[PDB]
Structure formats: structure tokens, C-alpha cells
From a paper:
Cytoplasmic dynein-1 (dynein) is a highly conserved molecular motor that moves toward the microtubule minus end, transporting various cargoes including RNAs, membrane vesicles, and viruses, and plays a crucial role in cell division. Dynein belongs to the ATPase associated with various cellular activities (AAA+) family of proteins. Its heavy chain features a motor domain composed of six AAA+ modules, a long stalk, a microtubule-binding domain (MTBD) located at the end of the stalk, a buttress region that makes additional connections between the AAA5 module and the stalk, and a long tail that interacts with dynactin and an activating adapter. Lis1 is a dimer (~90 kDa) with an amino-terminal dimerization domain and carboxy-terminal β-propellers that bind to the dynein motor domain24,25. Our data support a model in which Lis1 relieves dynein autoinhibition by increasing its basal ATP hydrolysis rate and promoting conformations compatible with complex assembly and motility.
We also prepared grids with samples that were pre-incubated with Lis1 before ATP addition. Because some of our maps showed partial density for the Lis1 β-propellers, we performed 3D classifications without alignment in Relion to further resolve this compositional heterogeneity. This analysis distinguished states with no, one, or two Lis1 β-propellers bound to dynein. The nucleotide occupancies in these new maps correspond to the nucleotides observed in pre-3D classification maps. In addition, the interaction sites between Lis1 and dynein in our maps are those previously characterized and are largely the same in the bent and intermediate dynein states. We also saw clear density for the second Lis1 β-propeller in the intermediate state dynein, even though the nucleotide densities in this state are consistent with the ones in the straight linker dynein. Comparison of this state (I6, 3.4-Å resolution) with our straight linker dynein (I3, 4-Å resolution) bound to one Lis1 β-propeller showed that the sitering interactions are conserved while sitestalk is shifted away from Lis1 as dynein goes from the intermediate to the straight linker state (~15 Å), making it inaccessible for binding by the second Lis1 β-propeller. Binding of Lis1 at the second site is unlikely to happen without Lis1 bound at sitering. We next investigated the AAA3 and AAA4 contact area and showed that Lis1 binding loosens the AAA3 and AAA4 interface, potentially favoring ADP release from the AAA3 binding pocket. Notably, binding of the second Lis1 β-propeller further loosens the interface, as illustrated by comparing the population distributions of interm-2× Lis1 versus interm-1× Lis1 systems.
Residue numbers in the entry:
A (entry chain A): 3316 to 3573, 3579 to 3626
B (entry chain A): 2384 to 2465, 2471 to 3005
C (entry chain C), D (entry chain B): 139 to 494
The structure:
Amino acid sequence: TSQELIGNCIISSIYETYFGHLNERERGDMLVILKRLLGKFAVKYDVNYRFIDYLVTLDEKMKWLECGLDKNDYFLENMSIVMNSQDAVPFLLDPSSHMITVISNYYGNKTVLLSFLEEGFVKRLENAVRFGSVVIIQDGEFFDPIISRLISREFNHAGNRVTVEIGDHEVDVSGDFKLFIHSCDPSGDIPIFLRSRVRLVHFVTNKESIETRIFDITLTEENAEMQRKREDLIKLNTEYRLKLKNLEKRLLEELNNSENDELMVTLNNLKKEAMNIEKKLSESEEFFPQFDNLVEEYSIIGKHSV
Amino acid sequence: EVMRPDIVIPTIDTIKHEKIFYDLLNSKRGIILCGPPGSGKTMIMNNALRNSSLYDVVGINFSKDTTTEHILSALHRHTNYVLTLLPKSDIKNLVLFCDEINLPKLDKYGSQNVVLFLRQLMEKQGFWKTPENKWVTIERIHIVGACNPPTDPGRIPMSERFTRHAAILYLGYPSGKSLSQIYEIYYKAIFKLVPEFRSYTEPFARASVHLYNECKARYSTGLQSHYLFSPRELTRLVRGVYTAINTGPRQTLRSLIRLWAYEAWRIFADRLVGVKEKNSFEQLLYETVDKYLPNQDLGNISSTSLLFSGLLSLDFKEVNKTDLVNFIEERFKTFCDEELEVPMVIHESMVDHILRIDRALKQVQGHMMLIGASRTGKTILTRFVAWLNGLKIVQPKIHRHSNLSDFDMILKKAISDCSLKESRTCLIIDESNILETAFLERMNTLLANADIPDLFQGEEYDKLLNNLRNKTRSLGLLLDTEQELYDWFVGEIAKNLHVVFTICDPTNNKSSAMISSPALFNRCIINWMGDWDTKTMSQVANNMVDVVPMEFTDFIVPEVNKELVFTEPIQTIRDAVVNILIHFDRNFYQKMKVGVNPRSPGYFIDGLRALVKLVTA
Amino acid sequence: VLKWIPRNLPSCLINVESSVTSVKLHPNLPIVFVATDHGKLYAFDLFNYTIPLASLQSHTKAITSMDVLFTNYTNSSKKNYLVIVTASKDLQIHVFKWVSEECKFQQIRSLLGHEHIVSAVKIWQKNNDVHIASCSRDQTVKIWDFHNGWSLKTFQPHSQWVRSIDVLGDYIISGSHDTTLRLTHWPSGNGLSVGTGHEFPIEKVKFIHFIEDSPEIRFRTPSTDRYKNWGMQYCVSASRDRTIKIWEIPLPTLMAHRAPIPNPTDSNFRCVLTLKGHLSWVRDISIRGQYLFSCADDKSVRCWDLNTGQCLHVWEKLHTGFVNCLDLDVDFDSNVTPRQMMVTGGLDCKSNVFMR
Amino acid sequence: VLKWIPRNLPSCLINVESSVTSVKLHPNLPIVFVATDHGKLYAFDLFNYTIPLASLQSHTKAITSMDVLFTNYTNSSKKNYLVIVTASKDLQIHVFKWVSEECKFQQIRSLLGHEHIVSAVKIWQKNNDVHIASCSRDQTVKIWDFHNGWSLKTFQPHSQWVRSIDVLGDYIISGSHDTTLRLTHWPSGNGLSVGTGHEFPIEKVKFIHFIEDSPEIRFRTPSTDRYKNWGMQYCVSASRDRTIKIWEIPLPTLMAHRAPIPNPTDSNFRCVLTLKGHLSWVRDISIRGQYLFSCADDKSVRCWDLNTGQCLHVWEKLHTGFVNCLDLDVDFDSNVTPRQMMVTGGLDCKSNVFMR
Ligand SMILES: Nc1ncnc2c1ncn2[C@@H]1O[C@H](COP(=O)(O)OP(=O)(O)O)[C@@H](O)[C@H]1O
Ligand SMILES: Nc1ncnc2c1ncn2[C@@H]1O[C@H](COP(=O)(O)OP(=O)(O)O)[C@@H](O)[C@H]1O
Ligand SMILES: [Mg+2]
């Protein structure tokens, strides 16, 4: 697993930036191109790599699902791209504008809504950035160049406090502040200055996404038991891994020094957990090709639908 | 003397045209000049009028927004009303200068007004006054004009009803002999400074003329809309060579050739776009040096290898690469400590561009425009070079809810700070800061002329004159006439105001209109930031991935084709990562159908930062 | 004996892990104090320069300036010792005491009150009272009482942020980032006069004191009885325009037992002599006897003559990188012995000492 | 100048979280580097040893030995920086760069290709090239480029696992579990002569250079003109016999501009002096001045003479367990100043530092 760390890490990083504004088809095409490039220069990478399985852990995945995001894989990838950009402010492009509720659920009452069409915009924005509350901006196609410093992050380190110049007077910021931009028009004109400096993410629904959602629907309706079994076994495997790590930490802390019944019970629990892990792996090895059979079974319906 | 803009070189063509111009102007006949933008119609016009004892000169410059009030104000300064209009001089007649007659716009119903005013003046021999409705007689005031052909994007053709009453002349580009003689005179004048190389005047002039001819013949308007070479570029080349030799060290022949090559690089090929075009330019330089200056022991004439700096010493001389890089590094560290901080990485292309922008900024009335993709480091480079030279940055904070009032008040405050308070300012102009064409024509007025007369009228004009008189009495200069105060003010403004233009997407309609403006294209040096070549990307990636542990696995060197390796030949896994990222970026920008649009490299930098952070974790 | 000139090569080389900012000399024993950019403060022996005597990390950022004074107390109750203050970019200045017996730094106290980074600090004694003055980026040229530890008089002489100061008696002149100089009266705070003529930010400006016995000096000898009763005649400047200018400080409307008053017709500085030849910003200057010792960012330290006004000697390529600060010994004070040494500090993490 | 014995009381008592395996010294700054058994590499400065400056996980198994060299590039294109290389049982040879400005480690690259425990690593610099030499327990001595990272030349010089490496000039002596130590050139990789006379594995061997003007040194003066032209005469070897043998390399058949050939009659080293009177295993031997320094496993370190060869000062109760390492400053290279401070290691999770 360490022979392929450099290959698997570069694919995640290159996925966060370049592939924000693409649908499923050219995303897969560029992933094929990237894999060919990595194989050309002899840099090893995981053949069974999945972006969700590499970055989106179970806890944050459940947190995003309970907030209100759709169960589509593409929306999960875009959500992960949006909330893993510490340096570049993300751009939200969704006609449905549903994700405002998702961000409000994620940040609780700290979510404060601002719009570029307002009139008391600059005062409340500078008050919020002085407080450090999270700010979400609507109607991004009418960009106001008064926040160009916030977009470019061109602060200066005046003393021990982070210092920025917005508008006509000096304002101070704090580390807790985060900014988001939400837009509604897919064809709305965007300035190049903002476009090349923000993480442009497209929350839309294309024909390939139509095919994916139809495959999801027919999978969750025709055979719901197998999908529920897959979700249950994945969650059980994650829970078993966490329990194995906790039991290993306890066993090492109890038996690394210098035995008693507690150490023997810990060893028995570790043996049982290892046997359970082996049984779960053996069971999961006979369940993955069923999904290949299903996707070979339910693609003509996708072609008809498109 | 070559710095002064009144100096002309008499050849056969200019004296022939002066003779026939005197013949036409004596004939009580209207005169119209029409030639290419590099013909020097204004030069020959000024030389003919200002050196004749039978005629005078009046200053009128037509623009898109021009009414008869400007003409009335201009004629009021030189003429008088007795109702016959009579010039002040009773011997020398008055010649009405009207340059760029094609520049005023048509009305809402397909007609132009000021050209009909000129038609009435030179046809009905007078005009009707508006406020008192009185007829005016004119007896000895003629009208002259000089405008480009209307086939270019931005000149509106005037009707035949005006051109019927005026004679028309065509002033084509001078032949090789005339240019050779003129620049022979210029090079003898410039070599009078250093007499040790006076025998090389003819090969230098021949090389410059041949280089200009080849540059005009090779790169045309069809490839790029801003490839409008002209003899004005040769004049600017000579001026640059003079301001380089004057502030230079003891001069040798090899250093002379290097100085000429660097000046040619920074005056002729800084507007090129394609890589193969730059290769053709360097081939042209090699061929010209081989043909006309057979000198041995001459080094590389690449753009990076021609580094002339005034920063490292008291005089303009060539400096080594490593010392210049270290000096720029430490100066940029001090600048980002004192001012806004940006994680900037040092590369040779930015060194070349910072030296060329420093050369451009030190010139008198030096203005330039930057053409490059977004996040290519243009505004930060301009701020850095302005802080290096003691300039003051006046960045126009223009938002969407803005109008002409904010623009004119910003310009007025900048002009007052430049003139009254005696502080040099470096003004930046962004593409997004010019919303409507009114700002564009305001910039046209500010750059083509030396000031904006629209800003100072009425009480503003009176308080401007009062402040100018106060400053003149403060400095103890014997100036009393309003004309002396005004032209001293515009001289101070032209001496203490350098403006730069930042353009992101030149393919866009607004950028195309701005670069197609004739008043801004000729007076500003066209600098093409362009896209990053593979070497610059490789250097940036190598300097950004060195801070992270990368080699931790057994790596087998992969044998790939020569053209597939952009970094220095592969030996480590870091070079493999850099080459993979560059190949991905090129393929991705190829498959997004960007066309000939510039490619923003911010994706590369963001990917590198995310890569190093994630691999560290 | 006052016309000593360092030889063409350094006597010894001192290695410091980071960029050297400020260097000062112990006025009684050959000990060199060196500040860093990582925040460390060092101390070295001149006869044994292999390893430092002691080091101490008191600030989280770089030290900008430092000076050394050996106190003199008339009463026998107090003990004479040494005071070191290191103005640093971490918003604070600290006071240290040299321990002769243990050869170990002992921090006395720390002052506060600046709203931005401090760039220069100077110390002096008038009559059995030690005062510390500092200038910072908030334009507040502050003063302090060493025994009390409290602020006394804070004033702002300039719009842009002041950079360097110098103090003598009750008069303080200060360079600033607005390329202008200005005297300010230390007890009152009124701006007596202003100076203009440079075209770049001011780096370092210090006084030109009087001297008792000399063959002839054209820049330190007082002219008339008014100057003799005043005490200050000329001042010297060093800015980023690669020039060193010697100025004449104008007379105020002085009154006996009263504060100085500015002269409406004579409140402007007068440029006397200009110098040029440095290839970059003149970082720091020093005056001893009749010779002007100055540095630059051209990896060199130049020696200038006050009378004839040209560079008598040049020390080119003294450091791989920039040169930061120099130091000599105070010659106008009888308490301090003007020894024959001069020490430099470069940006290339090396410190050179010139002796004999 | 080169005869400064440390004092009885050690200057610093550095606390380490685990047992110390190897210690090297910075050649320009008073900063000591400590390698632990867990693989931690510590950045300790002497004047305040309570807190580590930096500590990164180099390897995961036990680090065996390390060397520190200060790079010296004759071209201004490359800025000189420190290089720290570590070897362990993890089949890895990690290389670190120490930046003094940020006082933290920075891994450059790791060298791979060995198949067993790497024992010793030494650095040496050419005019513009840097090379890394290493040896595993698989009887393989390798050559690693600093920047390329490839393996240039490998060979098998012994029939048992090797534990000692020295590279000075273009030769190498490797002491295995067998007594056999051999000299092999780099361009050819051919053994010349074999050493015998110890009844246990040889742990550490280093050469002895030609010292400068010295009054009465005995084992460093050039004996014959041909030996002086060759440039290296003597050697010092360890053993588990509680003794140290100083050897003598016979001259090989040296021919101009070609790889030389060994001598059949002179294919064996000569024993000059035996260092008897020791009480345990001798781990590390390093040489400086008139005094040869060695470390004892029996809770002590002994430094004996070179001219007369007996005790002058014996250090006891420094560490309660087995002393592992020590580092005399190299007085043999003009690029480094031989300052007066010592450092010793041990197995008691501590390291003692001597200063002056
Ligand atoms: N006969 C000539 N003598 C000297 N310089 C000339 C001559 N003809 C052209 N030039 C140069 O060509 C340039 C033409 O500039 P300009 O008069 O502004 O062109 P235009 O009149 O077409 O706008 C001038 O800078 C001038 O130096
Ligand atoms: N090597 C580089 N060269 C140029 N720009 C860079 C480089 N690395 C990063 N940048 C980015 O470029 C930005 C500055 O570019 P700028 O001149 O403001 O672009 P624009 O001219 O489009 O406004 C910085 O915010 C920085 O993030
Ligand atoms: Mg023209």
C-alpha cells in the first residue's frame, strides 16, 4: 500500500481542482487519460481506486447525507470538492439552489445569507468578517469587485493579526471566517478574474447523470435487499475496523509492558475480530461481481432513456 | 536632441511634400492627408507649419465626442472678431489643423456634425453664430486634415460632400533609402557620444531598416490584429538605444551589439504571441547580425540571456543571471514584508518581464499594456516594479454600482497629486475597470493628449489656475500668462504620470476594441505576457515540490520519447511527477476546446499546492 | 590615534545561523553582540570567536535594532552595569543586563505600547537618569524611563511610518518612510523643523556631535557662539536613493528658561554636501573622527571622508549577500574609549570583525 | 590550540526519550543532532536543551549510524546547505536537509536497494560532486549519488556481515564480523590487502589524514615521500577484544591514469602499536590533535595519547549503561573550523555535551 501512495495521492489532488466543472462522461475520460499518463511514466497507483473511498470517510458521508444532499455519487464528489478547499473559495452553480439548506444544516445557526443585489451589503459583510461568521453569497454572476481582496486572499500580516483592506476603510478578519458563492444561472456570465481564482463546481443534471440516476432508481427498486446489504456490510466493515483499532490500542497498552485474564480476554477478542474480518472479506468477495452483472443488465434502459 | 519630439530629418520626400503642400495651401484650396498610421503625417505637418513664416499652427485634436465648442475655443485664442473673423497675426495666415477627421462619430440618423461644420467653413466661407444669429466672414483661414483610411475597425467614413471641397494626398511609407538616410543621421548623432565606434553608423542603420522591413513582411495583421508595425517603432528603438547608452558604462562593440539586440527584443518582439513566431524573430536577429555585423565572440541572443539592468549598479549595463535572481528574491521578500504578501515563486520569465517593465517605467511619458491570461502575475509585478522605483500605486476601486462621476473624481485626484503635490504615480487599468466606452474615450483623451480639459472647467478651471500660480510663486518662477501655467502643468503631468493597462482576455470584444484603439496602441508599448511555456512550468513545479518528502519507493527510470519530456532529462520521481502534471494540463486544455484563447495557469498552481499538502498529510 | 583605518581583510569571521540584523560592541571589553532574524540574540568573544558565550531567545520574530550603553552612576549605592535593548517585530521591546561574573544574559523587564512593529531604539543618559526612546510603524515615536518603566511622551511627527531616530540632549531627529526628515523637541514634542530633498524611504539618520581637539574639521567644528551655546550643528542622512546627504539643522526661536519655538522663515533644513557611489540602499552609517563609514546592499562597505568628500577606500564583496549594519566606538564621550575596531553584519548569515 | 581537554563536569546533560544510537555535530553552528533507537532524529541546541527544536520520524526500526557534512559548492548558482543522512534496519537510507532559518528538518530523498540491515554511512565532497557510501550486513558496499539517487558501484569485500565504513580520498576500509578489513578503490572495486589480528568483530575504522604544522606528533607525519604523495598512511581499528590496533597500509602498485593492482608480498597490513589497557567493547574511535578519543561500553569513555600511548584523563560515571557514540570535530579540513566542544552518547536515554 505504500508503493502506490504517490500515485493515489496525486489523483485525488488533481481531481479537486481540474474536474470541478465537468459531468460524468468527460470526468471518466480524463480519469482514463490520467491513468494512462501515470502508467506511461511508471508511477504505481491503486487499480481499485475510488475518490469517495479515499477521501469521503463514513462519518462525513453520513453528515452530508443527513444535511439534505442527494444520494448521487456525483453530488457527493462535488460536495467533497467544495468543502475540502482551504485556500480557494468555492463557487456553487446549482439551478435548484437546494444546497443553501445543506450548508445551513452543516453550519447550524452560523450560516448568514447575503446577496449582491442588496444595499446594506458591505456593512453587514464587513461586520460578519470581523465576527468571523460564515458567509454565503447568492447571484454570483453580478460580481462586485469590492471583495477582490477576499477572493484573491491578498491579506497583509500587520502585526500579529490578519489584515485586509475592503471598500474604503480598514477592516480586520479572523480565522473562523469562511466564504461561499452560490449562483443560479448556468449560462450567467462570470468574470474571468473570479473564474480563474475560485473552485468552479457545477451542480447540474446532465444526460449521463440521467443514466446514473435511472440505474440508481432501478437498483434501489428492483433489488433493494442487495443494496441494503451492501450498505450494511460497508458500514459493518468500517465499524469493525474502528473496533479492531481500539482493541489493538487497548491490547498493546495492556500487554506491551512485561499475562492476566484481561490480556487473555483481549487476545481472544482480537482473535474473534480477526476471524470476523476474514469472514466479512470472504463474503464481500462474492458480492462485488453482482454489481457488474447488474450494470451489464441495466444499461440498455439507460441508452433508451438518453 | 533626439529626445525632443520636434526634431525631423529632411529628405527628398518630405521637402517635395512640403513644396506641394505650400502650393496647395497658397491656392486657397482645402487639403486632406490620408495615409497609413505609421506615415508620420503629423510629423511632416508640424515640420512644415512650424518652420514657415507665412503660416501658423492651431491645436485641435478630434475625438469621438467632439462638438464645435472646442473649435470655437481654439479659434478664440488666435483669432479676433471685428462681423469678420480675423487672426491676430496680420501677415501669416491661419491653417486649421484637424487630425483624425474619421474619429468623430455619426449621429443617430447616419450623419456627422463637425465635418459638416468644417464643410460650411471651407465652402460657405464663414458660419452662422448660434447665440446672436450673426453672419461671420473668414478671409484667410484655411483648413487642413489628416486621417487614416476608414477600412480599419474604428474609423467612420465621411461623406463625399465634405471631401469635394478639399484636395486629397496619399503619404505612403518611405522607401528603404529615405529610412536609411534618416536613421543614418540618427545613428551619427547617437554615436557622437562615443567616438570609438563612429565608423559603424551605416551597418547599424542598414540592420535596423532591414529588420523593420522583415518584421513588417513576416508578421501581418491577419495572424494578429495588433501587428501594426511602423517607422514609429524604429524611432522608439533609437530613443531606447540613446537612453541606454547615455546611462551606461564604458561601451564596447560586443556590448553595443548586445544593447541593440536587447532594445530590438523589447521594442519589436514583445508583442509576439506564438512560440514559433519568437523562434522566427530570433532567427531574423541571427541572420541580420551575420549579414550586417560580422562580429565574433558573441553570446546567446535569447530573451532570457539578454538581461540589462539599472538595478544592480549606478548605470544601465548587463548583469549576471544569478546575482539578479538573488537581488530580486531579497527585494521581493522585503516588499512582501512591508506590503501585501503573496506566495510568489521566482522564475526566469518573471525576471525578464520585471526588467522589461522596469525599462518601460523609467522612460519619460512611458506607458505600456500587459496582455496575458489571468493569474499570470501582472498586477503584482506592476506593484512590485512601482515600489522598486519609488512610484505610488493608484488602483481604481471601481465596482459595478459606479458611473462616470467616480472615474472622473479618481482621475482628478490622481492628476492633482501628480502635479500639485509633486509625487510620481503609477496608474493601473484593469479590463473589468472599463465598463462603458466613456471610460475608454476618457483614457484616450488622457493618453493621446497630455491632460483632460473636460475635468477643469469654470470654477474648477479657475481654482486650478490659482493653485498653479500658488505653486509657481512657491518655486519662484516668473510665469504670469495662463498659457505658460497650463502647458507647464501638462508638461509636469506628462513627466510624472505613468499608466499601465492590464488585459486578461484579449479575444474578448472589449479587449479587442481597447487594443484596436489608435490613440492607445501607438503610444503604449505592447507587452505580451501570454501563456506559460513548458520550461517556466517546470521551474515553478520544481521550486514548489522541493519542500516535501517525495522519494520513498523504488523507482525505475522510464524510457520515453524525447519530445514527451519537458523538464530536464528524467532522473528522479519528482521529474516524473512534474512531467505528468504538465502533460495532463496540456491535454486537458487541448480537450476543453479553448481555441486560441489564453490558458489560465491557476489550475496548475492550485493543483500543486493541494498535492503537496495532501502528500504531506 | 583617531585616524585609524581597518585593514583590507577581516580579522575574524563569526557564523550565525540566520540573517544578522544589528551588531553592537561592548564599550569596555572586546565582546560583540549580534542579533538574528530567527529571534535569537547572541554574544561572542573577539579573541575566541569559535563558539558563542551565550544565546537567548526572547522574541517570536526578528530583532530590528539594538544598542549598548554602559551606565555611569554618581552615587556609590548603585552598581555600574550594561544595558541591552533589542527592538523586535513581535510588538515589544526587551531590556537585558550583562552579567560579567556568569557571562549569561539576564532579562530585566519589557516595555509595551506600540501598535505595530518597532524599527529603531536609542538609549542615553542626561544626568543620573536613563531614558529609552523607540520609533515604530504606528508613527508613535515613544520615550521611556528605565527606572520607572512607564511611557512619558508619545508623539507622531510624520504621516508615513518613521524608521530611524537619534537622540542628543533634549533633541530628537527622526527619518521616516515619507522621504522627509524632521526634528522634534524631546520634552515638549513640538516640531521645530522639517527636511526635504530625498526621493526614497529613509534608512538611518544620526547626529554629528561636537569634538574638542582636531586639526581641522569642516563638518563638526561649530561656527558661531549661537551654535556653541546650542550644541548641535550638522546632521547626516542615508536613504534608499543610494545617496548620503549632510544637512544643516536650522536655529529655532530659542529663549532662556523656555521651550524652543519654530522659526517661520528658518524652519527648513538646508542641504550642505551630497555623496554618491553606493550601488544600492545605504543601510547604515557611522561617524568616528572625520571619516564616514557606511554600507549598502551592494555586498560592500565604503569609507568616506568628511572634508574632501570622496570615497578613500572600498571593501568590495565583503559578504555574499546584503550588508545590514555597522558600528564604531563613540568618540565624543570621555567615558567610552574609542578603540580601533569596527564590526559589520551581513544578510548572508556571517559576521565580520575588523581589528587593528 | 588543538589540545583542549574537556573538563570533568560535562557542560550539558541532554535528556532523550529513548536510547541514543549516534550523534553528529553541526560544523558551523552550536547545534547537536541526536539519533534515537526508535528512529527519531532530534535537533538540539546547546544553550537551551530543555526543548527540541525539531524531531521527525526518519525510519521506523533502529537507526544505526549517521554523518553530517556541510556542502560547499564553488558555483554561486547553488546555495550551500547542510545535509544529514541516516541509516537503519528499515532497508532505507534517508537524506535530510536542515534549514537554519525555519529550524526544522526537510527530507530530500531516500535511497533504496539494500537487502539487509544498513550499518554505516559516510559523506565526502568532491569539487562539485557529493557522494554517499553505505554498507549492509549482506557483505555489500555501495555508492550513492546525492542528487541522482542511483547506485554507482557495488561489490562484495568480505565473507561476513560488515559493520565499519570510512571513505577518505578514494579508498575504503570495511571491518566485518570477521577480523578481515580490506582496502578497495572506487573506480575498480578491487581488494588490495587484508588485516588480521583481532579475535572478534571490528566495529569502527577511520583513516588518519595529514595534520598541519605540529611540534612532536608521531602517527600523522609523512614517513616516506611516496607515502606523502599517495596522501594517506595510517589507520585505526576497533575490536571487541578490549583493545585498539593502529595499522599500516602497504603501498600498492600505483600506475598513472589507471586503476592500480595489489602486491602479493605486501597484501597484508602491518601492526605498529597496540592500545592495551581497556575494559570493555570499544564502539567509536575518532581522532583530533595529539589525543585519540574512544568510548567504552563499561559506563566510561577513555581518551589516550598518540605519541606515548597511555592514559592522561579517564572519564567515569558519565552514563550508567553502555556509551554508544562520540564525535570529535574534524580538524583535517580547511572548510570547517575545529572548535572546542565535545558530545558523547549512551544507552541511558541521555547524551553528555562538553563545551570548552
Ligand atoms: N522624414 C522624417 N524625419 C524624421 N523622422 C521621421 C520622418 N518620417 C517619419 N519619422 C518618424 O516616424 C514617426 C511618425 O510618428 P507620427 O508623426 O506620430 O505618425 P502619424 O503622423 O502617422 O501619427 C515619428 O516619430 C518620426 O520620428
Ligand atoms: N509563479 C506565478 N506567477 C504568476 N502568478 C502566480 C504564480 N504563482 C501564483 N500566482 C498567482 O497569481 C496571482 C497574482 O496574479 P495577478 O497579477 O493578480 O493576476 P491578474 O493580472 O489576472 O490580476 C496571485 O494571487 C497568485 O496566487
Ligand atoms: Mg497618424
